[PDB]
Amino acid sequence: SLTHRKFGGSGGSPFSGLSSIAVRSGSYLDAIIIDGVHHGGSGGNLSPTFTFGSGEYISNMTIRSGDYIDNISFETNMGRRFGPYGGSGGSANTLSNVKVIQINGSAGDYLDSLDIYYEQY
């Protein structure tokens, strides 16, 4: 059962554990790089890194996928865009009016799958 719990007091300034995203891409996503950590293969070309600002999060995203992740694009609450990166295969699915909390997945030579954890608004 997916949930969250807060521990501690009321001070400080908020932070998120998710800080940056890059990809390697060609016809597919070869890799995703999350907070600098590489997952996937060495093919394709490395995108610039998208670093989330304070209070910035993915609010909408389009993923093309099939057996692998073919393409990713996203936009943040600040209106900044990442991608599209990747190819034209697969089929498209979109998340809208969300707040992405985390990205897990599975990878080998390519990025096989993504598990997106998000709040739906």
Residues that bind its own copies (CB under 8 A): 1-20, 34-37, 39, 63, 65-69, 93, 95, 101-108, 110-121
Would you count residue 56 as binding ligand MAN (CB under 6 A)? Answer: no
Would you count residue 84 as binding ligand MAN (CB under 6 A)? Answer: no
Q: Kindly tell me which residue out of 1, 11, 17, 120 binds ligand MAN, with binding defined by CB under 6 A.
A: 11
Would you count residue 47 as binding ligand MAN (CB under 6 A)? Answer: no
Query: What is the C-alpha to C-alpha distance for residues 73 and 20, in angstroms, rounded to an integer?
Result: 14
Measured between alpha carbons, how far is residue 77 from residues 20, 33, 64, 72, 74 in Å?
Answer: 15, 21, 21, 17, 10
